[PDB]
Amino acid sequence: STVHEILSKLSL
Amino acid sequence: STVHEILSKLSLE
Amino acid sequence: PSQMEHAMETMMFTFHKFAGDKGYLTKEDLRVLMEKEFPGFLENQKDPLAVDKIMKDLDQCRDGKVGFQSFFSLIAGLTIACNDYFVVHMK
Amino acid sequence: PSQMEHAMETMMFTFHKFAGDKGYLTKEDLRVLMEKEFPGFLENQKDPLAVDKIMKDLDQCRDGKVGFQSFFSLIAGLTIACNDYFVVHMK
Amino acid sequence: GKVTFPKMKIPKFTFS
């Protein structure tokens, strides 16, 4: 659940 | 548990 | 089995799930795979061509095929960026 | 979250659990980490300096510290060898 | 059955 959070605040 | 099995059959180098 | 072993098996099983007996991923396999496993990641990129940006530098050779090791470099890149984020902030 | 997100997180958290607050691994941490996470793997290396030899491969900057990216390189090497064996004998 | 440690070859993502 913390990985999922971070993945959505992240870009190429 | 398949990874666990495979690991015990591996070695270095 | 340890937690790491389960993690490793999961990555290994996820690759084969979306690559099939062909034993590799095409752009489309990759795109489905990202859609099923990393949906919030894709939606946060407002670009209908993220899978294309990503496919591009996985496919160093331009054969449209992405094998397991290359697949692992994708997961590696994400997890690394998450960790960096995590270190700067969440603790 | 997805199967992949779960697996990724356990990889992230495993690092930090053994790296502690200093945020990196010493050869001691690495050795403990593989003892707990891949005991069947160590128990099959005839070599007694095998951890030391993995440390040498990981420690590119020769500063005795192993960071997350190096850690992931380890897991990479392990997971890719598993998958190789998997394809050959098991799939 | 041999294990080598890959020096990748990692795609990068940002912020943060």
Short mmCIF file of C-alpha atoms in Angstrom, two decimals:
data_model
loop_
_atom_site.label_atom_id
_atom_site.label_comp_id
_atom_site.label_asym_id
_atom_site.label_seq_id
_atom_site.Cartn_x
_atom_site.Cartn_y
_atom_site.Cartn_z
CA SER A 1 0.00 0.00 0.00
CA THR A 2 2.90 2.45 0.50
CA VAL A 3 4.46 1.46 -2.88
CA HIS A 4 1.04 2.05 -4.51
CA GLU A 5 0.89 5.53 -2.96
CA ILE A 6 4.37 6.49 -4.22
CA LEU A 7 3.76 5.09 -7.72
CA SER A 8 0.97 7.65 -8.21
CA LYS A 9 3.28 10.58 -7.36
CA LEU A 10 5.88 9.58 -9.91
CA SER A 11 6.67 10.16 -13.60
CA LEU A 12 8.82 9.13 -16.57
CA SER B 1 7.87 -22.24 -2.82
CA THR B 2 9.11 -22.99 -6.31
CA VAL B 3 11.63 -20.13 -6.02
CA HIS B 4 12.66 -21.59 -2.66
CA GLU B 5 13.30 -24.94 -4.28
CA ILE B 6 15.19 -23.46 -7.24
CA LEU B 7 17.43 -21.33 -5.02
CA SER B 8 18.80 -24.42 -3.28
CA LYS B 9 19.95 -25.73 -6.63
CA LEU B 10 21.92 -22.61 -7.62
CA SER B 11 25.54 -21.54 -7.10
CA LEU B 12 27.84 -18.57 -7.62
CA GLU B 13 30.31 -17.43 -10.35
CA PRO C 1 9.34 -19.68 2.07
CA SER C 2 10.60 -16.26 3.14
CA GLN C 3 8.90 -13.06 2.13
CA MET C 4 11.60 -12.26 -0.45
CA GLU C 5 11.18 -15.70 -1.96
CA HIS C 6 7.45 -15.01 -2.35
CA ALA C 7 8.20 -11.62 -3.86
CA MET C 8 10.63 -13.15 -6.32
CA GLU C 9 8.21 -15.90 -7.27
CA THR C 10 5.49 -13.29 -7.80
CA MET C 11 7.58 -11.24 -10.22
CA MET C 12 8.56 -14.43 -12.01
CA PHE C 13 4.95 -15.60 -12.19
CA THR C 14 3.66 -12.17 -13.27
CA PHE C 15 6.11 -12.16 -16.20
CA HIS C 16 5.00 -15.54 -17.45
CA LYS C 17 1.34 -14.68 -16.91
CA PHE C 18 1.44 -11.81 -19.44
CA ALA C 19 4.14 -13.12 -21.77
CA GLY C 20 2.65 -16.59 -22.32
CA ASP C 21 4.40 -19.60 -23.80
CA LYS C 22 6.12 -17.24 -26.25
CA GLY C 23 8.36 -16.52 -23.24
CA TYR C 24 8.51 -12.78 -23.83
CA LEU C 25 6.43 -9.60 -23.88
CA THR C 26 5.43 -7.41 -26.78
CA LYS C 27 4.41 -3.79 -26.37
CA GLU C 28 0.82 -4.96 -25.99
CA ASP C 29 1.66 -7.59 -23.36
CA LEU C 30 3.62 -4.90 -21.54
CA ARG C 31 0.69 -2.46 -21.86
CA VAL C 32 -1.85 -4.93 -20.48
CA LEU C 33 0.57 -5.95 -17.77
CA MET C 34 1.09 -2.32 -16.68
CA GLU C 35 -2.68 -1.78 -16.77
CA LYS C 36 -3.44 -4.74 -14.52
CA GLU C 37 -0.51 -4.21 -12.11
CA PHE C 38 0.25 -0.46 -12.10
CA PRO C 39 -2.96 1.46 -13.01
CA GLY C 40 -2.40 4.52 -10.80
CA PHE C 41 1.09 4.83 -12.19
CA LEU C 42 -0.24 5.04 -15.75
CA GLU C 43 -3.13 7.42 -14.96
CA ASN C 44 -0.74 9.87 -13.19
CA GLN C 45 1.16 10.17 -16.45
CA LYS C 46 -1.19 12.18 -18.60
CA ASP C 47 0.27 10.55 -21.72
CA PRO C 48 -1.53 7.92 -23.85
CA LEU C 49 2.00 6.86 -24.89
CA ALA C 50 3.74 6.05 -21.60
CA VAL C 51 3.91 2.36 -22.54
CA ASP C 52 5.60 3.53 -25.71
CA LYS C 53 8.15 5.67 -23.85
CA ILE C 54 8.80 2.69 -21.60
CA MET C 55 8.84 0.09 -24.41
CA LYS C 56 11.37 2.24 -26.21
CA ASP C 57 14.29 1.89 -23.80
CA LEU C 58 13.56 -1.66 -22.79
CA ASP C 59 13.88 -2.55 -26.44
CA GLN C 60 17.56 -1.67 -26.82
CA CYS C 61 17.70 -4.08 -29.71
CA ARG C 62 14.62 -3.12 -31.70
CA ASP C 63 13.00 -6.56 -31.94
CA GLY C 64 9.71 -5.67 -30.18
CA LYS C 65 10.43 -8.44 -27.64
CA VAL C 66 10.92 -7.87 -23.92
CA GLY C 67 12.40 -10.82 -22.02
CA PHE C 68 12.44 -11.50 -18.31
CA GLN C 69 15.66 -9.72 -17.56
CA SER C 70 14.54 -6.57 -19.33
CA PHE C 71 11.19 -6.94 -17.53
CA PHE C 72 13.17 -7.01 -14.28
CA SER C 73 14.92 -3.77 -15.18
CA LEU C 74 11.49 -2.11 -15.46
CA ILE C 75 10.45 -3.29 -12.02
CA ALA C 76 13.88 -2.32 -10.74
CA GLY C 77 13.54 1.25 -12.05
CA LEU C 78 10.11 1.77 -10.47
CA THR C 79 11.01 0.24 -7.15
CA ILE C 80 14.17 2.31 -7.01
CA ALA C 81 12.27 5.55 -7.69
CA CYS C 82 9.72 4.56 -5.02
CA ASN C 83 12.49 3.96 -2.53
CA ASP C 84 14.13 7.33 -3.27
CA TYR C 85 10.74 9.01 -2.80
CA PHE C 86 10.25 7.01 0.41
CA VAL C 87 13.62 8.05 1.85
CA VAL C 88 13.22 11.74 1.09
CA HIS C 89 9.72 11.80 2.60
CA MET C 90 7.84 8.95 4.27
CA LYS C 91 10.30 8.48 7.17
CA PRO D 1 -2.67 -3.01 -4.42
CA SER D 2 -1.58 -5.41 -7.17
CA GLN D 3 0.53 -8.54 -6.83
CA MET D 4 3.47 -6.61 -8.30
CA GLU D 5 2.99 -3.65 -5.94
CA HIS D 6 2.98 -6.03 -2.98
CA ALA D 7 6.10 -7.86 -4.12
CA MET D 8 7.86 -4.50 -4.77
CA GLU D 9 7.01 -3.20 -1.33
CA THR D 10 8.35 -6.30 0.41
CA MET D 11 11.56 -5.80 -1.50
CA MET D 12 11.64 -2.16 -0.41
CA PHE D 13 10.85 -2.98 3.19
CA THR D 14 13.24 -5.93 3.41
CA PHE D 15 16.09 -3.60 2.48
CA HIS D 16 15.16 -1.13 5.18
CA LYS D 17 14.56 -3.78 7.81
CA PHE D 18 18.16 -4.92 7.45
CA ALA D 19 19.70 -1.57 6.48
CA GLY D 20 18.23 0.10 9.56
CA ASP D 21 18.29 3.86 9.99
CA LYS D 22 21.74 4.30 8.39
CA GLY D 23 19.96 3.34 5.16
CA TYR D 24 22.55 0.95 3.73
CA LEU D 25 23.94 -2.55 4.16
CA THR D 26 27.28 -3.59 5.62
CA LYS D 27 28.59 -7.03 4.77
CA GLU D 28 27.21 -8.00 8.18
CA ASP D 29 23.73 -6.79 7.26
CA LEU D 30 23.93 -8.51 3.91
CA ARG D 31 24.99 -11.76 5.50
CA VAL D 32 22.20 -11.61 8.07
CA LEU D 33 19.70 -10.67 5.33
CA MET D 34 20.53 -13.69 3.18
CA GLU D 35 20.68 -16.00 6.17
CA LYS D 36 17.07 -15.06 6.99
CA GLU D 37 15.82 -14.58 3.42
CA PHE D 38 17.66 -17.20 1.40
CA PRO D 39 19.00 -19.81 3.84
CA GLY D 40 18.59 -22.69 1.42
CA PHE D 41 20.74 -20.76 -1.02
CA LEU D 42 23.66 -20.27 1.41
CA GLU D 43 23.31 -23.82 2.73
CA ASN D 44 24.11 -25.01 -0.82
CA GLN D 45 27.23 -22.92 -1.48
CA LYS D 46 30.21 -25.15 -0.67
CA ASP D 47 32.20 -21.91 -0.45
CA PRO D 48 32.31 -20.41 3.10
CA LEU D 49 33.37 -17.02 1.80
CA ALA D 50 30.38 -16.87 -0.58
CA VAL D 51 28.76 -13.93 1.21
CA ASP D 52 32.11 -12.14 1.15
CA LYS D 53 32.34 -12.77 -2.56
CA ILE D 54 28.84 -11.43 -3.19
CA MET D 55 29.72 -8.37 -1.14
CA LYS D 56 32.78 -7.83 -3.34
CA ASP D 57 30.63 -7.96 -6.50
CA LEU D 58 28.05 -5.61 -4.98
CA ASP D 59 30.43 -3.06 -3.45
CA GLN D 60 31.26 -1.07 -6.59
CA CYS D 61 32.43 2.01 -4.72
CA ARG D 62 34.50 -0.13 -2.34
CA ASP D 63 33.18 1.78 0.68
CA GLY D 64 31.70 -1.26 2.45
CA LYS D 65 28.21 0.14 1.96
CA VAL D 66 25.55 -1.46 -0.20
CA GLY D 67 22.59 0.66 -1.18
CA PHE D 68 19.18 -0.14 -2.50
CA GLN D 69 20.15 -0.19 -6.16
CA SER D 70 22.99 -2.62 -5.41
CA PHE D 71 20.57 -4.63 -3.29
CA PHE D 72 18.20 -4.85 -6.22
CA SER D 73 21.08 -5.94 -8.43
CA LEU D 74 21.52 -8.90 -6.04
CA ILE D 75 17.86 -9.83 -6.15
CA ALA D 76 18.06 -9.40 -9.92
CA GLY D 77 20.90 -11.85 -10.24
CA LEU D 78 19.07 -14.31 -8.03
CA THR D 79 15.66 -13.93 -9.69
CA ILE D 80 17.01 -14.13 -13.20
CA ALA D 81 18.92 -17.34 -12.41
CA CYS D 82 15.75 -18.83 -10.90
CA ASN D 83 13.77 -17.90 -13.96
CA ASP D 84 16.44 -19.38 -16.22
CA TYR D 85 16.30 -22.68 -14.33
CA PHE D 86 12.50 -22.36 -14.27
CA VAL D 87 12.20 -22.15 -18.04
CA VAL D 88 14.70 -24.96 -18.68
CA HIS D 89 13.40 -27.58 -16.19
CA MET D 90 9.98 -26.46 -14.99
CA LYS D 91 7.83 -24.52 -17.47
CA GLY E 1 22.66 -23.00 -12.76
CA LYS E 2 25.06 -20.09 -12.28
CA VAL E 3 24.33 -16.78 -10.52
CA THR E 4 25.96 -13.56 -11.71
CA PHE E 5 25.22 -10.10 -10.38
CA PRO E 6 23.91 -7.86 -13.15
CA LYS E 7 25.06 -4.29 -13.31
CA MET E 8 21.96 -2.77 -14.89
CA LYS E 9 20.73 -1.03 -17.21
CA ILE E 10 17.93 0.61 -15.20
CA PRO E 11 15.17 2.85 -16.67
CA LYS E 12 14.78 5.98 -14.53
CA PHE E 13 11.67 7.72 -13.20
CA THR E 14 11.41 10.97 -11.28
CA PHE E 15 9.93 13.14 -8.52
CA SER E 16 10.91 11.53 -6.36
#
